[PDB]
């Protein structure tokens, strides 16, 4: 029997797209004479803040009207800069994407009614979730219990928060959790702990688009799109994969 | 591959069969009419010195005798009590079960120089342990780490002090560390936390015998009280077995 389910926020319970960061880069750079496309924006997505800034400075559509404009081309200060300003304009922000995830209210309060327990990691600081999680529970959503890397000696990918999660919530053999999220970084830490690792498809980051860009999208440009999601996760500790939340009671059951 | 050593304290590194409380735990019981066996007492040994007396009163045997001198089943006071007792006499002599069981401090430095962490686990409350450690340390032993039951939630069986220990160390996958301890208590702490579980014998609680009485032990009387506890340890949950501590530096190779 699994005794507890652990969840992971933005692209799994909250921010269908995960576009919170998307939108502090873009601005950093428009802002600044550069227009970035969300697709420019969203390559570097999984690399440490600053080395995803260095990385839009070297696609060349973008070095090449930064020159038309500075008459320059991009420095190490230009670099050290827009960095400082990310967390700000982070902040302004977030209270705008907290919204719960479609459909995910009706699964937790399905799981709860099971007696099942729920926790929750993240990657965001203990600051930035005195935000978040302040919005989400006037919406709708609040854990049992939450954790940020800032309780534990490192973050993701090391297993220390899940294993405080299970110190907290009075559950043990591992394997006797389930952990959820909606990037590759989520599957190394649910495998590190030695729990069952689930991956969801739409509306995580890791696909990139808007609940609109997935409905009204053509029927085999869509299902190629998720393919490439499935992959991913799979090839890099995912135990199952998932389309939506509402189908995690069943590899629930799996597991048997 | 093995980066960590989990030890517990008394029975296992140091003492030699404890007895630093089981004459404590005898007379509490006899000064009330009751009388109790080096056998039974010597059972609930590894839990919270607290949680331990709270099990000699659930023994159908014993409790059948607190309601014969007294109706009453023994309640909060005939257990708040005797344990007010208990940390009076037993903190008179302490630091006289401080000392390493022989040839412990050859293995450690052994398993140093070779790159493993060595970590621990208790039963004693923090105030004690801050007396035994002391001595130990001057007498050979000071360990990586130390947690005790006053860091976490709860005491052996709960795996809360381990999960502890491998945060603190940094190890990951819970299955590259080997846990070991000399009673049946220390055996279920070891697989509720997924590491290898191995039990000493020699010099153990279980087997509750003197250094010298164990030299003058007959043959047919120690080949076989040896496995009335080879059996006690396996039969719940040990991965393997061993007579005093040379031959951990192999069960280590062997898993490989
Ligand atoms: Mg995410
Ligand atoms: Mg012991």
Known sequence: KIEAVIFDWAGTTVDYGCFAPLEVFMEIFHKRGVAITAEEARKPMGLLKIDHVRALTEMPRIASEWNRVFRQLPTEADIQEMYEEFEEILFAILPRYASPINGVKEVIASLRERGIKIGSTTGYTREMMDIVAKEAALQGYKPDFLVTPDDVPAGRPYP????????????????HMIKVGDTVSDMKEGRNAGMWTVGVILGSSELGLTEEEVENMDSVELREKIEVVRNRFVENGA??????????????????
């Open 160 to 175: 220390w928060m899940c294993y405080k999660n299970a110190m907290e919530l009075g559950v043990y053999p591992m394997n």
């Open 239 to 256: 135990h199952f994969t998932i389309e939506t939340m509402q189908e995690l009671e069943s590899v629930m059951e799996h597991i048997e």
